[PDB]
Amino acid sequence: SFSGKYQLQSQENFEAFMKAIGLPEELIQKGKDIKGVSEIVQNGKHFKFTITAGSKVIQNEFTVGEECELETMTGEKVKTVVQLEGDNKLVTTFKNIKSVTELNGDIITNTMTLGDIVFKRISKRI
């Protein structure tokens, strides 16, 4: 359902959000225009997802409904649960960030929001 390889097309408030969560500026300025590749492999409730941003690789894993440990952008790993809000939506909270991943056909739309910052990424199947 979710599986596939996707690249970012566009994103909103990368800089603002990454500062707020403590991404080191050095990595902000490099990664701000990288159109990153996300790779998803779903097997029923079981998901594995890789997020590559040049030379940075974040490999994560979770079963829906179950507790998981998600390595975040800074490197911090948080304990949380990811849930389906439908077949097309994946949904979670970590580090007070609300996260919504929406698949429509070939388009994955990810929104992360901390307080009033809404970090939105639009990715296309590749």
Ligand X SMILES: CCCCCCCCCCCCCCCC(=O)O
Indicate which single residue of 24, 30, 35, 125 sits in contact with ligand X (rule: CB under 6 A).
Answer: 30
- 121 touches ligand X (CB under 6 A): yes
CA angle, corner 103, sides to 82 and 55, nearest 5?
75
Residue nearest to ligand X (CB): 31
Question: In the beta sheet, which residues pair with residue 119?
Answer: 112
H/E stretch holding 4: strand 4-12
Nearest approach, Cβ of residue 58 and ligand X (Å): 5
- 31 touches ligand X (CB under 6 A): yes
Nearest approach, Cβ of residue 94 and ligand X (Å): 7
Q: Which residue has the tokens 């800089």?
A: 15
- 80 touches ligand X (CB under 6 A): no
- 99 touches ligand X (CB under 6 A): yes
Question: In the beta sheet, which residues pair with residue 108?
Answer: 103, 123
DSSP string covering 33-94: S---EEEEEEETTEEEEEEEETTEEEEEEEETTSEEEEE-SSS-EEEEEEEESSSSEEEEEE
- For ligand X, the binding residues in 45-74 under the rule CB under 6 A are 49, 51, 53-56, 58, 70, 72-73
Interacting residues with ligand X (CB under 6 A) = 27, 30-31, 34, 36, 38, 49, 51, 53-56, 58, 70, 72-73, 82, 90, 92, 99, 101, 108, 110, 121, 123
